[PDB]
Design a protein around this nucleic acid. Sequence first.
DNA 1: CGGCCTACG
DNA 2: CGTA
DNA 3: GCCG
Length: 327
Amino acid sequence: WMPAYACQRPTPLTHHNTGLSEALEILAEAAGFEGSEGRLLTFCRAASVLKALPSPVTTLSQLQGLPHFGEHSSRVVQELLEHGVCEEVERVRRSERYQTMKLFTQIFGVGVKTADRWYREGLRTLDDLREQPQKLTQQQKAGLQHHQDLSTPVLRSDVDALQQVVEEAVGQALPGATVTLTGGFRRGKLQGHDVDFLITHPKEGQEAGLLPRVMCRLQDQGLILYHQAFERSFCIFRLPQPGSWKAVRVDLVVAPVSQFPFALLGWTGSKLFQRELRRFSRKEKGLWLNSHGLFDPEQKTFFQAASEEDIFRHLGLEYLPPEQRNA
DNA sequence: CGGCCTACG
DNA sequence: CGTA
DNA sequence: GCCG
Ligand SMILES: [Ca+2]
Ligand SMILES: [Ca+2]
Ligand code: NA
């Protein structure tokens, strides 16, 4: 019954199997740290399947037939049901390698490959990295400098204040341009690690050159701690707070209005939902999906979409609102 | 056996 | 590589 | 790790 792709089923923000899904997601993260994206994907998919179930899993029987559950994922759930812990998960959680790779990869500018090299070189703490600034890109230096603030969850009050200052800079740069909140907050999350905004203009072509003008205006008002023709900017903002300020990660994306439904769909996520949707598009429908469009490679044409709904329909999928894309 | 999302900075 |  |  349960469809195999995450884009074929609603996944709400609040679900009934958090304990099991979190354990599988530890194994997925660990698989990524060891360089097996395939195992990561399977463990992520299996966790997502549990998020889409209508009720708590209490019996191994209830896993029968579910997609992406084989011997390994089923054994993990079995142990959790019988004993409340899975030895493999606990061994991973308590391992120095897992703990350090999680610490390093959570830095803005550091991924698995970089963290692994630092691990192999003996480094273990943020202080170790600060001790060796020559080994850091400018992006990594900013990530490390603002790490404490960037580890603090971004809340809705932060989003509203940020949207206001982004709208003001955007309006100064180009009358009639619009700002749309995307990412997890658009899916209904109450917190996030960053805020995502999608910027366009109703007249095709007027948005050319917009993002540099927006960034200059934000930087002139003292709002930019880090950034850097371009159409995406992964920034750190200096967000005013009562009597002070805190650093907040902000992503800005500019798209022409012809691409806006594709950009909105891509940037609203979740990350697993969108990878699954792009996989479905290519493997099941023979069409190539990205944040710019949906391409038929045999006719060499792009699908004209006015809404996210149009895209789902052209893929033969029942429409899912953003709050049901929490795969 | 091999595939596993995508492309910009 | 990083965004992730 | 799971699946086409
Ligand atoms: Ca986000
Ligand atoms: Ca983001
Ligand atoms: Na990172």
